[PDB]
Symmetry: D3
């Protein structure tokens, strides 16, 4: 089966300058119906196709897939190749994780954080999805 959530915050863009990971609002999957099911697994893709980051010390952004049981299932990020890019170019980002559904998991969700004092931005379509299989 498929579980899916997307956002498209054109009118009210998202940003973070947080050094710690914080939730990306709207990018959460409810997997309660499948929990406590050791024979099931979720393959989870976080797709942030058009992010950027502003800043003045080799800016970038980090992303993670986590559960509400404190498991960091995957992480990664982008950075620029200059200290102060004259344009914060759009840097497509995708991240793929796996999680057994054996445990009492309820939520699989996206988080983000900054790098070197940057501000990370999302102002367009992004998604999180899972394929759940036996």
């Amino acid at each position: 089966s498929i579980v899916f959530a997307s956002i498209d915050p054109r009118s009210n863009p998202l940003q973070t300058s947080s050094q710690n990971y914080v939730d990306i609002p709207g990018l959460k999957l409810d997997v309660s119906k499948y929990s406590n099911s050791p024979c099931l697994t979720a393959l989870i893709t976080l797709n942030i196709p058009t992010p950027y980051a502003s800043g003045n010390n080799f800016p970038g952004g980090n992303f993670a897939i986590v559960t509400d049981q404190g498991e960091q299932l995957a992480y990664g990020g982008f950075t620029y190749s200059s200290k102060i890019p004259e344009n914060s170019g759009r840097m497509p980002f995708t991240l793929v994780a796996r999680y057994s559904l054996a445990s009492n998991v309820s939520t699989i969700k996206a988080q983000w954080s900054n790098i070197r004092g940057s501000t990370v931005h999302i102002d367009s379509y992004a998604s999180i999805s899972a394929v759940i299989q036996c």
Copy 2:
């Protein structure tokens, strides 16, 4: 089930300088067999791992997943961090969408468009795929 199409236009590369979205030839999925099926959903991934864009005003490229019912299911793109990059570097791009198969859909396909008068280029492997589940 899986539906899949790929291209690999090494000998005859693809390009667009179109401001409006136009089809990427060869990156189309036929989902007719699954249409009018409200209990089915497709999770669709467009993978353009090695595109670039030429131009002189912060060039880039945009991509979309659409149906032949006029639904834009997802969009995003890449841009460079300089006004006139001395090399149009390869900027891997992936985009993930979801579509209920309730409607009379026949085709799910990839489109692209330019940015600020750029020319977008594909000269190597790219794919579009879907997982269809109940």
Copy 3:
């Protein structure tokens, strides 16, 4: 069903300066249980979310999905937009392939290679996965 492998080589990073494709250790899928099954197909995603490449001639990195039957199912890569980037920025990369399981396949795996004498680096989470369906 889902098949999955990941790495997270923070303490002992990976690198290659190989012009020919070589295996990324740890990014291998065992599909033996599904082989010789013409009604089955694998949809395979290689996710390298945080690679970079060092070098002095427009550096970058290439990646491929292959089988142990010599099939190159997909390939692509990233490159920088400068001859000698002052920072080798992190360039998220994903690649999606399809393979019929009709043949006597045992292994689907990731490979990488350099570009123009670069060194490609992985020092954090990366994965390879497949959805196997009828």
Copy 4:
């Protein structure tokens, strides 16, 4: 998926002397979750392994699988080979039906009726089940 209901009325046996079909209490399947799903079908088995019928004019019993939309999906029955059997022997009975789940169906259930004024009896395990597939 599987939907299932059984009864085992040892302490309070069931009987009917009804000429018209009437519900067998407890032998009902709730298929509401799957309704309005044209791509789904149910394969339904009614298993009455140990019924009998009393009477004096070639007794027997009839059974049917029906929906709450007035569809009689299957029917059949047993009869004895004598006008007045000296023992109403146990006559195992099974019945298999198919139903598309396209419609607004809620319930698939078992019914029974008599033959030639008989009384039909169930005093032990019986079941109704469905396999639901795409």
Copy 5:
């Protein structure tokens, strides 16, 4: 998935006095779409809930599930407990078989034959079905 066929020959009943197995018309499954698929198996149920047999030497009827490759996957039958039953009572019959779909099979079908010169009769609902799984 489910494959299914039924008959309900109330207006034009079926009979056989054949000593050799012959096809029951209408009780045939087309499995061509699944053939040459070693990872698939069919679980096949033949349900004849209300047959009888006439005759004067301990009459009965035999049934079989066969393919068009000459495989007899299952067989069985009913007989009466008297030499000349005064009423040929209805004797519910079900038969379950399994078949790998590895081979070039096209058809799985029902057959019947007599016993000791009997005539076997079907004048009401009967079905043949399969569940096909990986």
Copy 6:
């Protein structure tokens, strides 16, 4: 998926005169691969299409589906309509059960027992099968 076992003891028929349930040799399903899986269920059919029973006090036979955890999932049987049938006619028998695979189950199997001092006989094809679903 399907699990299946059959017997066809033409050359060396089976019989029991046991008052207690005893295993029918060969009619056992190994479900170990699916055990400890609360999201999975088995729908189990025992098909004895051509049994009979000998004896002189309203003979018959009983059958059950059991696990190796002492669960009697289903039971039923046939009996004749005379005290001493002049021919022990063939009395087709089918029995359907359901079992959650949550527990540490290894085996689902068929048992039989006599009635009123009868001897129950199987000298031809019989099967036990399960459909296992999520």
